[PDB]
Write a protein that binds this ligand. Structure first.
Ligand SMILES: CCCCCCCCCCCCCCCCCC(=O)OC[C@H](COP(=O)([O-])OCC(O)COP(=O)([O-])OC[C@@H](COC(=O)CCCCCCCCCCCCCCCCC)OC(=O)CCCCCCCCCCCCCCCCC)OC(=O)CCCCCCCCCCCCCCCCC
Ligand code: FES
Ligand code: FES
Ligand SMILES: [Zn+2]
Lengths: 58, 56, 49, 100, 281, 76, 188
């Protein structure tokens, strides 16, 4: 399980517990799905290489 | 008739909220019996059109 | 203790911990106090026998 | 310099000293307010401030309330209890959560 | 069909049909006044205890910040929250809870925060989580009282001011199947018990939630200054310290009062008959 | 009679600890006998007695059932 | 898994402390963080097994907290209950309870409503060495526990910096300017 916290522009805060298998990475352009088990959205040091898009089935 | 309050008219405490939530989820699960799951329902809805002139 | 003269149950209304400023604690919640065990009002926790 | 104690609730921790303070302040106030009556009477813990028939005087008790308020820095609710003896004063003082 | 019935046509035995002997009357009066009588109900609260278990801690496995964070994410959907908290973690947060209770709580539809909070409440108040909510009693809770009797308490199903909306049923079901033409069948009136103020007890059934909702409706639209921006280590107030202030005269007076032979010494007359009294005037 | 007062305090502290340990709870009042001067019966001002200054304070658990042993012994 | 393990050697972690600091540094009653390690896993799992994790120090809720001399971090987030300090006359040597939660009906003082709300904010019982007029904090955020240290100005500025607070203040300003515009155009 992964807990995700977001916040709206009016200060409302939303919390959602989502199973790990729901996450599917998108490509850099976010046009197409990104291949799981082989995808580099983290640089060598370990930080985000770009704004990563992830799709959740539910 | 079934009361919508499930016997808990007021959530004066959060334990009342928990009891109502548990009973409400069980009640809704029992109601949604004989109604297919999301995947099967979407499969039936998307593949509804079965009228094509030419097949392979 | 709520008394009944040989009847299995009685309607009981609870208004919580009554105070001097307001004569009632919470809203008048009714229930059917039955015979056999202790029973309590979940709104205020008052145990009825 | 004598540093005041850090631990709070010292009034409740010394019942004897609290009773001594109550006796002292009540005695001073009663001798000032009604010298013709209380200047010869020793005031101890069992001393009451009522008539021989149990009838209480409101003026004397309100004077005692003022004395206790000034001595301990408290606000005695005059409408809830009337101090007619040293025992009642002790109960009121030890019941308050901010005496000092 | 059954025939007519008149219960007054049949004898009943509530009074013995023989009269007591005179000697037996005298001996019985003597005997009953030679021993204590049975006690009569006393409604004083001797040593009240918290009805909702121990009060939440400032710091520990489970504190009040957890309760607040629970409040700010309340929702009642049509589907389960299939994200299950670890039963080991639930057991760790609430040390006394057993494995079966933690697993069953994880098998309910609560979000993990609510799962841990519900585990805390259920363990502290002795709630039975396997009790299915119906229109007779919404909950069951086994608690041992001050005499160690291990009684059970059944949280009933209630109605808001309206007996007409009350489900007067005797089945473990939610439906309203029974319809009574005569609500008070035996003419016994319902009761709204009034509580004597002198015999009240301090509120301990989740007393810390009475204003909760109100406050949480005011803090949802409130922006709080981060601790990075809140000034700290500001100069102390000149006249205030962590130790409550006592004048040196008061400290000296208490030191003098420590002595056993203390007397006011400021009286005009020797009212305490002290051998070492010097008139101050 | 200061001994009367101190013995009453000690007895009621022991009774509170014993009853709290029996019931797996905490005391509700910390007032030995209920009288209406504080109005704590129907107001929100408790008579709870828990005073300490930090997490290392030895007197943190005084007044709570955690202060007593399973034999209802006053210390630890 | 394998792809992650290939690059896991070079990955570097970052601290989880952000915009919150350490509670034990700015607040008593909070023991310093302790790393608890689990025991060996149980050979058999029984339905009636309670936890075997090492116990954790349990600090009860204090009835009230002392005056922390200029070093006061609220135990929980309080209700602001006003951005202006009260100017209250405090008597010398009299014990005052200051409302930390902010929901008290009795002005700056505690009353009893902190026991009726889910918060760790306990009243600050303090005593002044000299009677006089003091600026009692009413925003409940001041580092001086019962006194004002002009933190409410920072709170107001932060509220104005937020998007919703900016919109609210500009909406009120435009409402007042609409009133002023009507008063200015009243003779057209
Ligand atoms: C007077 C102020 C002046 C200074 C303004 C300064 C900036 C103010 C805004 C700052 C941010 C405040 C918070 C905003 C909402 C944030 C919450 C959120 O999630 O939002 C997403 C949310 C989506 O819903 P959600 O996320 O599912 O749920 C909301 C939250 O969960 C939960 O949220 P909630 O439920 O708590 O709140 C609900 C509330 C939330 O919304 C608000 O509070 C917004 C209140 C109004 C804001 C107005 C200022 C807009 C600021 C940007 C302007 C940029 C100008 C510069 C660039 C362009 C011009 C060159 O919903 C509404 O108010 C309902 C919609 C109201 C629409 C008003 C439309 C006005 C149009 C004016 C132009 C046309 C006039 C003629 C026609 C009139 C009829 C249409 O969006 C909204 O609710 C708001 C919708 C409207 C936003 C766009 C407004 C555009 C205005 C254009 C004006 C052009 C003027 C003419 C040109 C001038 C130059 C040439
Ligand atoms: S401390 Fe604020 S209401 Fe008591
Ligand atoms: S009101 Fe001024 S700092 Fe709090
Ligand atoms: Zn009730």
């Amino acid at each position: 399980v992964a807990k995700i916290e977001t916040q709206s522009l009016a200060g409302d805060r939303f919390t959602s517990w989502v199973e790990t298998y729901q996450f599917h990475p998108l490509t850099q352009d976010q046009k197409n799905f990104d291949n799981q088990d082989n995808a580099e959205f983290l640089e060598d040091e370990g930080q985000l290489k770009y704004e990563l898009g992830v799709q959740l089935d539910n | 008739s079934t009361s919508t309050t499930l016997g808990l008219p007021r959530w004066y405490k959060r334990i009342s909220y928990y009891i109502f939530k548990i009973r409400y989820l069980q009640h809704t699960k029992s109601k949604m019996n004989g109604i297919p799951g999301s995947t099967v329902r979407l499969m039936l809805i998307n593949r509804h059109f079965v009228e094509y002139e030419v097949y392979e | 203790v709520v008394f009944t003269s040989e009847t299995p149950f009685r309607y009981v209304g609870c208004t919580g911990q009554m105070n001097e400023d307001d004569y009632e604690g919470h809203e008048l919640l009714f229930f059917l106090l039955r015979e056999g065990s202790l029973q309590r009002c979940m709104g205020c926790g008052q145990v009825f026998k | 310099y004598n540093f005041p104690e850090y631990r709070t609730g010292g009034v409740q921790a010394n019942p004897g000293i609290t009773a001594k303070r109550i006796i002292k302040c009540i005695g001073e106030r009663l001798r000032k307010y009604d010298p013709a009556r209380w200047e010869n009477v020793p005031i101890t813990f069992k001393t009451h401030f009522r008539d021989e028939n149990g009838y209480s005087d409101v003026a004397t008790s309100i004077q005692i309330h003022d004395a206790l308020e000034r001595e301990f820095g408290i606000d005695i609710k005059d409408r809830l209890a009337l101090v007619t003896d040293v025992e009642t004063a002790f109960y009121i003082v030890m019941s308050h959560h901010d005496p000092l | 069909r059954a025939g007519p019935y008149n219960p007054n046509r049949y004898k009943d035995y509530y009074i013995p049909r023989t009269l007591p002997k005179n000697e037996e009357i005298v001996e019985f009066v003597q005997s009953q006044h030679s021993v204590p009588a049975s006690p009569i109900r006393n409604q004083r609260h001797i040593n009240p205890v918290r009805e909702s278990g121990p009060l939440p801690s400032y710091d520990g496995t489970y504190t009040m910040e957890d309760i607040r964070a629970v409040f700010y994410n309340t929702t009642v959907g049509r589907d389960y929250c299939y994200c299950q908290m670890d039963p080991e973690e639930i057991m760790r947060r609430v040390p006394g809870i057993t494995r079966k209770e933690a697993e069953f709580i994880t098998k309910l539809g609560l979000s993990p925060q609510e799962q841990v909070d519900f585990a805390y409440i259920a363990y502290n108040i002795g709630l039975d989580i396997f009790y299915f909510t119906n229109q007779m009693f919404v909950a069951r809770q086994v608690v041992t009282n001050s005499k160690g009797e291990k009684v059970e308490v059944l949280w009933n199903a209630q109605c808001y001011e309206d007996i007409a909306q009350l489900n007067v049923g005797f089945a473990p079901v939610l439906e309203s199947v029974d319809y009574h033409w005569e609500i008070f069948l035996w003419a016994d009136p319902p009761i709204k018990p009034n509580n004597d103020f002198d015999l009240n007890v301090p509120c301990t059934w989740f007393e810390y939630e009475q204003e909760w909702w109100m406050e949480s409706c005011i803090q949802e639209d409130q922006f709080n200054l981060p601790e990075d921006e809140r000034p700290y280590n500001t100069p102390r107030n000149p006249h205030c310290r962590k130790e409550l202030w006592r004048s040196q005269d008061a400290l000296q007076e208490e030191e003098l009062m420590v002595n056993e032979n203390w007397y006011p010494k400021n009286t005009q007359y020797n009212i305490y008959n002290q051998p070492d009294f010097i008139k101050p005037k | 009679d200061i001994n009367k007062y101190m013995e009453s305090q000690l007895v009621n502290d022991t009774l509170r600890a014993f009853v709290s340990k029996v019931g797996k709870t905490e005391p509700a009042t910390w007032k030995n006998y209920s009288t209406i001067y504080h109005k704590d019966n129907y107001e929100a001002e408790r008579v709870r007695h828990v005073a300490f200054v930090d997490h290392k304070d030895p007197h943190m658990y005084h007044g709570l059932p955690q202060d007593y042993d399973d034999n209802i012994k006053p210390k630890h | 898994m394998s792809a992650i393990l290939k690059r896991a050697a070079k990955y570097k972690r970052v601290s989880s402390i952000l915009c919150e600091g350490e509670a034990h540094l700015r607040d008593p009653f909070t023991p310093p963080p302790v790393i608890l390690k689990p025991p060996a896993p149980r050979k058999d799992k029984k339905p009636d097994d309670i936890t075997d994790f090492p116990a954790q120090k349990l600090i009860p809720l204090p009835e009230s907290i002392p005056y922390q001399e200029g070093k006061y971090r609220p135990a929980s987030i309080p209700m602001v209950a006003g951005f202006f300090p009260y100017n209250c006359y405090l008597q010398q040597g009299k014990v005052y309870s200051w409302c930390s939660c902010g929901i008290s009906q009795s002005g700056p003082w505690c009353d009893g409503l902190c026991n009726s709300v889910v918060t760790r904010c306990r009243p600050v019982v303090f005593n002044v060495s000299q009677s006089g007029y003091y600026k009692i904090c009413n925003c409940k955020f001041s580092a001086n526990a019962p006194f004002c240290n002009n933190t409410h100005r920072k709170m107001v500025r932060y509220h104005h910096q937020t998007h919703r607070g900016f919109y609210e203040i500009w909406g009120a300003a435009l409402f007042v300017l609409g009133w002023v515009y009507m008063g200015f155009n009243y003779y057209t």
